Design a protein around this ligand. Sequence first.
Ligand SMILES: Cc1cc(Cn2c(N3CC4(CNC4)C3)nc3c(N4CCN(C)CC4)cc(Cl)cc32)cc(C)c1F
Ligand SMILES: Nc1nc2c(ncn2[C@@H]2O[C@H](COP(=O)(O)OP(=O)(O)NP(=O)(O)O)[C@@H](O)[C@H]2O)c(=O)[nH]1
Ligand SMILES: [Mg+2]
Ligand code: NA
Lengths: 167, 166, 469
Amino acid sequence: GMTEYKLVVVGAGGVGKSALTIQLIQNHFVDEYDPTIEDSYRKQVVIDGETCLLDILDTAGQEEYSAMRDQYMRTGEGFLCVFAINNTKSFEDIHQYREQIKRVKDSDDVPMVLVGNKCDLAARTVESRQAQDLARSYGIPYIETSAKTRQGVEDAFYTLVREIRQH
Amino acid sequence: MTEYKLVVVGAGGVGKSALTIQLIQNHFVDEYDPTIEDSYRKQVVIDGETCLLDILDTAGQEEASAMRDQYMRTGEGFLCVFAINNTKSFEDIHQYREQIKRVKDSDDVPMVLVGNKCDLAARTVESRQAQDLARSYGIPYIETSAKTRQGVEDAFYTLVREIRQH
Amino acid sequence: GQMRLPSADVYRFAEPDSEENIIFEEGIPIIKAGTVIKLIERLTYHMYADPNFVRTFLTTYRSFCKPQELLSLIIERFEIPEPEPTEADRIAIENGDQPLSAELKRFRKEYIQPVQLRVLNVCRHWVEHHFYDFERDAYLLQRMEEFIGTVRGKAMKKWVESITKIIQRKKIANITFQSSPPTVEWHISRPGHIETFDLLTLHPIEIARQLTLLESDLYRAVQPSELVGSVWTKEDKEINSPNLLKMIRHTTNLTLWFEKCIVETENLEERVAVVSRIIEILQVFQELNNFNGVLEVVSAMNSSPVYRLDHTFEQIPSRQKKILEEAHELSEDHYKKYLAKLRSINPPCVPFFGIYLTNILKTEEGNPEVLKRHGKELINFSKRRKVAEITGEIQQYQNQPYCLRVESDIKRFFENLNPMGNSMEKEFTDYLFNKSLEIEPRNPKPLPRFPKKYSYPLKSPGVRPSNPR
Ligand SMILES: Cc1cc(Cn2c(N3CC4(CNC4)C3)nc3c(N4CCN(C)CC4)cc(Cl)cc32)cc(C)c1F
Ligand SMILES: Nc1nc2c(ncn2[C@@H]2O[C@H](COP(=O)(O)OP(=O)(O)NP(=O)(O)O)[C@@H](O)[C@H]2O)c(=O)[nH]1
Ligand SMILES: [Mg+2]
Ligand code: NA
């Protein structure tokens, strides 16, 4: 049948990372969620005219279980590496997430996207040029998203699927 | 997992709360803090089947006696508890039994009769008198001690079996 | 007829229900949303008790009402005006007779006494199970003491005097079993010889038991105040969630210790014995329903430094591979089989906490604090109910104690385990990965040989328990 893509969200905690998958998967248009329901993290979508199933792993809230990162990352085919645009430390953490994904996957060329997330109205401290330059240094796309308006959210996940398809 | 709604009823001070907390936590409460209404949950395997017990621990003090219909409507089985050193608490059993029957409009409500404080030597209700009453109700009679744990699992899990076979 | 109520202008909790102030879900009603006044009315409702709702509310209310304001509101709820004499009472009094006061007596018996007793039950639950509000605000405690200590009148007296004593006990603040715990098991290390304690010298049964007692205590210590508000993810997490973080840091340390024992055993035959012993410990964690322990082992075996050790993998017996496979299968498909197993076992158990953390965080992030209806903001109570369903599940598995004896020296050994030493996490996990590359280099580099490091027998004593008389 249709292709299933196993996508994994990684990134610092405490800075609204979970809004990316929630807004995707949501009833886009009813602001509501029960994460405990069976397949609150599976979504059938059409990308460039080809239907597929996204299975998204987002372990937001488990960041302190730092020795489980490999156990969780090993499940994934593509990765969203998320930082918050008002949290410079979360941006600085990206390099190490990327190194750990390369190590678990035993590959220098794992499908991944860099995502800069706007999780509140607090002042931005990472400029888009800084994040574009980082993404370009890694050879991966950069997408910015809003945690409140759903802007950028479909682009982040669809861009990752395109990276997998074109790998 | 089937869920079972158990309700523990009986006169003030007979040990409803101590029985419940012994079942839930394996701890005996020495204090006598009169209950208003407390609720507990317990996942447990009984006769090979996992279930979830919701246990309502009710007020025995007479000042709460006008507030019972509301918990009797919801319960699926009732532990009717008296203390074997308290003859008044045994005489109070029939009032609870009759009220449950009226509220649930049924002659066949799952119930177990429990004679608690059986660790105490100075008994004033004989086992035979309680057993006769239980037979007249069609229900089992189990003597318990919240202090030593004697009979405690038997009382609650017999009530689950009553509900299961109802 | 229904009882008449005080005028809503002297008593705010008699306003009629409308969709501008309460919305129910589709045999007692379940509240979707409401004003704080309506939530407190239904918290203390005259027609029924709702002990679930008391726990849900007292667990979650600080997201929409400060503790000082809650106390003010429930004192207001408690102070119910009595109705004036009716026409028949007046005529009796005019004739020098005693009035029957039928409506007054009914209102006392069916409205005032149940509402007041249910307010006191809120106070009792607040003090017994959510006392941190009072630890953190001494003036709130003074107000509660004063309120309880000045309730007059005999219908409430037993509970007033009891709650007064409960408060005084909480300010200055034993297990019985069906059977005896099993005998503590020993292998190469003997009692009192803590300097020889290590992965292969302690008995694998007793490693698993003592880690299960430690992990069970760490699980049982986490209170809901560490979880609501997603506070373990925020900047003050060390202040607000210390028991949760201690629990997680223990789990992390054990996973890293398992990895360190494996990759620092450079001799292949010895390293196989190490891995086999860790899978035996996993088997006993499964037998004990210690799922935290299960996942600690799975996380180490799936880590980058360990996963790649193909020469070690080749020598592990298929039966042990099968044990590890069935443990990893619990985590597959978003923990589908783990969730079913947790709900089917007979406690005691030690749940894996991380799933609860993700579900609480996503429930709080994915639902709005308020619902807007007819121009009014109503508290979204359904969201709080969902959070308290999770905290209630956590608490249900915190009740049952393990019937296992503590060994104080083995306990201390695992409490003090510190595989990273003074190294930071990145430099330590790079060290583990480079150690993996040293002991089993990437193809086509040849596989080196390394000397043995253990002078004692590597044969396991097995994981079936012994029982002398
Ligand atoms: C040193 C060592 C490492 C490992 C690592 N490892 C593997 N190996 C396959 C491999 C051989 N070349 C690659 C490494 N598969 C693992 C696994 N899966 C879960 C999903 N199932 C469908 C297949 C099994 C789960 C876990 Cl938790 C660990 C796994 C395992 C053992 C027993 C061992 F002694
Ligand atoms: N020796 C002994 N004492 C017991 C036993 N069960 C309860 N008690 C004691 O009896 C007293 C009352 O117990 P408690 O559980 O509060 O009774 P209750 O039926 O819940 N009272 P209420 O109806 O007011 O809530 C406490 O001091 C308790 O320690 C028992 O099996 N043995
Ligand atoms: Mg009680
Ligand atoms: Na910053």
